[PDB]
Design an enzyme around this catalytic site. Structure first.
Site, short mmCIF file in Angstrom:
data_model
loop_
_atom_site.label_atom_id
_atom_site.label_comp_id
_atom_site.label_asym_id
_atom_site.label_seq_id
_atom_site.Cartn_x
_atom_site.Cartn_y
_atom_site.Cartn_z
N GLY A 96 0.82 -1.19 0.00
CA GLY A 96 0.00 0.00 0.00
C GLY A 96 0.87 1.25 0.00
NE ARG A 124 -4.24 -2.36 2.56
CZ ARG A 124 -2.97 -2.06 2.76
NH1 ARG A 124 -2.01 -2.72 2.12
NH2 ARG A 124 -2.64 -1.06 3.57
CB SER A 168 -3.44 8.22 6.24
OG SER A 168 -2.70 7.54 5.23
CB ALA A 169 2.29 8.35 7.62
CG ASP A 316 2.27 -0.92 10.39
OD1 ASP A 316 1.05 -0.83 10.10
OD2 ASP A 316 3.20 -0.49 9.64
NE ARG A 347 -1.77 -5.91 9.59
CZ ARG A 347 -0.57 -5.34 9.44
NH1 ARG A 347 -0.24 -4.22 10.07
NH2 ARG A 347 0.31 -5.90 8.65
NE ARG A 388 4.25 -4.77 10.39
CZ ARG A 388 5.56 -4.82 10.17
NH1 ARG A 388 6.36 -5.57 10.91
NH2 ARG A 388 6.09 -4.06 9.21
O1 LIG Z 1 3.65 5.81 5.40
C1 LIG Z 1 4.05 4.66 5.70
O2 LIG Z 1 5.20 4.26 5.38
C2 LIG Z 1 3.18 3.75 6.44
C3 LIG Z 1 2.04 4.23 6.97
C4 LIG Z 1 0.98 3.38 7.64
O3 LIG Z 1 -0.19 3.34 6.77
P1 LIG Z 1 -1.38 4.47 6.76
O4 LIG Z 1 -0.79 5.72 6.12
O5 LIG Z 1 -2.50 3.84 5.94
O6 LIG Z 1 -1.74 4.65 8.23
C5 LIG Z 1 1.56 1.98 7.97
O7 LIG Z 1 0.48 1.08 8.26
C6 LIG Z 1 2.39 1.43 6.81
O8 LIG Z 1 2.87 0.07 7.04
C7 LIG Z 1 3.60 2.31 6.55
O1 LIG Z 2 3.63 -3.09 7.35
C1 LIG Z 2 2.49 -3.18 7.89
O2 LIG Z 2 2.29 -3.72 9.01
C2 LIG Z 2 1.32 -2.53 7.21
N1 LIG Z 2 1.58 -2.18 5.82
C3 LIG Z 2 0.55 -1.35 5.23
P1 LIG Z 2 0.93 -0.93 3.52
O3 LIG Z 2 2.37 -0.50 3.37
O4 LIG Z 2 0.77 -2.20 2.68
O5 LIG Z 2 -0.13 0.10 3.30
#
Ligand SMILES: O=C(O)C1=C[C@@H](OP(=O)(O)O)[C@@H](O)[C@H](O)C1
Ligand SMILES: O=C(O)C[NH2+]CP(=O)(O)O
Length: 436
Positions: A96, A124, A168-169, A316, A347, A388
């Site tokens: 994602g 997703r 959401s980052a 996570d 999850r 995970r």
């Molecule tokens: O910006 C990132 O690198 C991430 C942000 C998170 O997702 P969301 O932005 O959907 O919270 C996290 O679950 C993912 O594994 C890594």
């Molecule tokens: O690493 C994790 O636990 C969640 N990853 C979320 P994604 O990077 O696939 O949006």
């Protein structure tokens, strides 16, 4: 079709170095690709998710030398406008982060791109990035607001002020990346602060960020400048060992050179609230990311009511934290964590199912879980193809009364290619075996 099979542990011991941070790796290679000059990236995570990002960038003409055996990339940047139209869809695999960050990068290019992924990724949610990118002038087609996505690049995007509607980052990062290509300022307001690696790397690559009253802002038209990067160990990968050592009698381990960014420290903050014995030492800062060694010893735990500010800082780590909650004394309550339902798998549903199967009284809430601390039994659980969930139940096997069979662990390599090797090296017994 591979499964994991565990037997209980007589105690974890030793010093281990976990592989690189997945989040920082994604950003490092992407920004390096469009920077001017050469960036050497040390500690790059050579997992499936990060290598999918690399391959996607190479299809667009990024110059990346992959030294897989050394966890190094050498990137010769192509500048902000140096990418080229790819000949086929970009396959983001299970990632994602890759699809969402690439969408931001690609929204303002002068060419069109199709982004796809595996069966998990194609379920997703993408409305969260499609909506604000569209406000910037982007054109992104999707059926049902999930991938595959077709991006009709618009080299004349315009900046926007956007308040994140969920913590959401990835959305924040997607918009900052599109902001590098947009006319004027793009300002993001975060009511629930999330990981800030994009912000830190932008500074590392000499791209200026401004902050006002309530937001962080970038202005389009700047230039990223190459700067060597050392990627810290992934705290999310280290978290499995932190919990395993915490819950398994006789354990004492040291995790070397792990990233300890405060926006990633939730698992340690919460475990300490439960009574964990965790020491962070040898703190150093490099490439704008803090790193440290983490020493963990067995400790008895109590259940806690998890506060909402910690959810985005621990997102996570909830799978493995729920294993700690399962063996704590008392009740643990997690609320305001509905984002867990839209990950590689749901999850909450996956953890509740596995915990019940191992004899733990776990109940689902719409936005979380309620767990009554108890005693883990041997049994059989399903990963639901989520790395995970798989590793979390491998950790459960350290203290379970009997063997634990974890179905479908082939996705562990998306984030932790050498999980089994490192687990056995420190004392948490795990065998990779053929499934049904
Ligand atoms: O910006 C990132 O690198 C991430 C942000 C998170 O997702 P969301 O932005 O959907 O919270 C996290 O679950 C993912 O594994 C890594
Ligand atoms: O690493 C994790 O636990 C969640 N990853 C979320 P994604 O990077 O696939 O949006």
């Amino acid at each position: 079709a591979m499964d994991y099979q565990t037997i209980p542990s007589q105690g974890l011991s030793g010093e281990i170095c976990v592989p690189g941070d997945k989040s920082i790796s994604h950003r490092a290679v992407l920004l390096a690709a469009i920077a001017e000059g050469q960036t050497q990236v040390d500690g790059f995570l050579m997992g499936a998710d990060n290598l999918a990002m690399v391959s996607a960038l190479q299809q667009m003409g990024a110059s990346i030398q992959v030294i897989e055996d050394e966890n190094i990339l050498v990137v010769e940047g192509v500048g902000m406008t140096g990418l080229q139209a790819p000949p086929e869809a970009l396959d983001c695999g299970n990632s994602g982060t890759a699809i969402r960050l690439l969408s931001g990068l690609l929204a303002g290019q002068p060419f069109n791109t199709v982004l796809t992924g595996d069966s998990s990724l194609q379920r997703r949610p993408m409305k969260r990035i499609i909506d604000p990118l569209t406000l910037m002038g982007a054109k992104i087609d999707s059926t049902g607001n999930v991938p595959p996505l077709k991006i009709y690049g618009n080299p004349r995007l315009t900046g926007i002020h956007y308040q994140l509607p969920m913590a959401s980052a990835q959305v924040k990062s997607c918009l900052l990346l599109a902001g590098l290509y947009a006319r004027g300022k793009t300002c993001i307001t975060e009511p629930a602060p999330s990981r800030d690696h994009t912000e830190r790397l932008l500074k590392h690559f000499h791209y200026t960020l401004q902050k006002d009253k309530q937001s962080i802002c970038v202005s389009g038209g700047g230039k990223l400048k190459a700067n060597d990067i050392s990627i810290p160990g992934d705290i999310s990968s280290a978290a499995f060992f932190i919990v395993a050592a915490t819950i398994t009698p006789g354990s004492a381990i040291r995790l070397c050179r792990v990233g300890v960014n405060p926006t990633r420290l939730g698992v340690i903050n919460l475990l300490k609230m439960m009574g964990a014995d965790i020491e962070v030492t040898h703190y150093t800062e490099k490439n704008e990311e803090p790193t440290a060694d983490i020493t963990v010893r067995h400790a008895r735990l109590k259940g806690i009511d998890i506060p909402p500010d910690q959810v985005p800082l621990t997102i996570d780590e909830f799978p493995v934290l729920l294993i700690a909650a399962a063996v704590a004394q008392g009740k643990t309550v997690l609320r305001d964590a509905a984002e867990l339902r839209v990950k590689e798998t749901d999850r909450i549903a996956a953890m509740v199912d596995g915990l019940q199967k191992l004899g733990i009284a776990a109940e689902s809430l719409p936005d979380g879980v309620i767990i009554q601390g108890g005693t883990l039994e041997g049994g059989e659980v399903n990963s639901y193809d989520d790395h995970r969930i798989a590793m979390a139940f491998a950790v459960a096997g350290t203290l379970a009364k009997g063997p634990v069979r974890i179905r479908n662990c082939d996705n562990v390599k998306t984030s932790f290619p050498n999980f089994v090797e490192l687990a056995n090296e420190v004392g948490m017994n795990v065998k990779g075996v053929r499934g049904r």
